[PDB]
């Protein structure tokens, strides 16, 4: 499992979520453990009864920014990439918690499979961070939505300090985002 998996589905649909999450493991490079956008799109293309409702594959932050402001920006990007309107405050809570844990609370996550440390110099830290949402509720109707998200994050903070960075801190971030939303007809 190379993704931080976040299931927001009814229990009766957990099977489908597991299947689709398993399927997207195939987009992980075996060596770098980066997320491969092209491969994720190939995988999406092969799925039955499915369509892609949004994608992104580009840099989304490249500046000095407060971590909270960055998180808010990425929430709005996720809103766009979803290509579905989910009204649930709790769903959006799940999303924002996951985005927050991409940049903060890194100390407890240091050895988790979903984070990949790369450059760890005196002047810079870079890492990959991967999240996978499965989503099914009233606003997905007859469908489940699957949203794999990978970030490539470079920040001008040395690792030891980054492990304790908070939403109120600022630093110079370079963040590349690769994501797609695929919807598949529910599971009978």
UniProtKB/Swiss-Prot annotation:
Keywords: Plasmid, Sporulation, Toxin, Virulence. GO terms for molecular function: toxin activity. GO terms for cellular component: extracellular region. GO terms for biological process: sporulation resulting in formation of a cellular spore. Active after proteolytic processing. Belongs to the cyt1/cyt2 endotoxin family. Kills the larvae of dipteran insects by making pores in the epithelial cell membrane of the insect midgut. This is Type-2Ba cytolytic delta-endotoxin. The chain holds residues 42 to 229 of 263 of the full protein.
């Amino acid at each position: 499992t190379n993704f931080n998996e976040i299931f927001y589905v009814e229990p009766q649909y957990i099977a489908q979520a597991i299947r689709l999450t398993n399927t997207f493991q195939g987009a992980i490079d075996p060596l770098t453990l980066n997320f491969n956008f092209e491969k994720a799109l190939q995988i999406a293309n092969g799925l039955p009864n499915a369509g892609v409702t949004g994608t992104i594959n580009q840099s989304v932050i490249h500046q000095t920014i407060e971590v909270s402001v960055m998180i808010s920006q990425i929430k709005e990007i996720i809103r766009s990439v979803l290509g579905l309107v989910i009204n649930s405050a709790n769903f959006w809570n799940s999303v924002v918690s996951a985005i927050t844990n991409t940049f903060t609370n890194l100390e407890p996550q240091v050895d988790e499979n979903w984070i990949v440390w790369r450059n760890l110099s005196a002047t810079q830290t870079s890492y990959f961070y991967k999240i996978l949402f499965s989503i099914q509720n009233e606003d997905t109707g007859r469908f489940m939505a699957i949203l794999p998200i990978a970030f490539e994050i470079t920040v001008d903070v040395q690792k030891q300090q980054l492990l304790f960075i908070t939403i109120k801190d600022s630093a110079r971030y370079e963040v590349k985002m690769k994501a797609l939303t695929v919807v598949q007809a529910l599971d009978s």
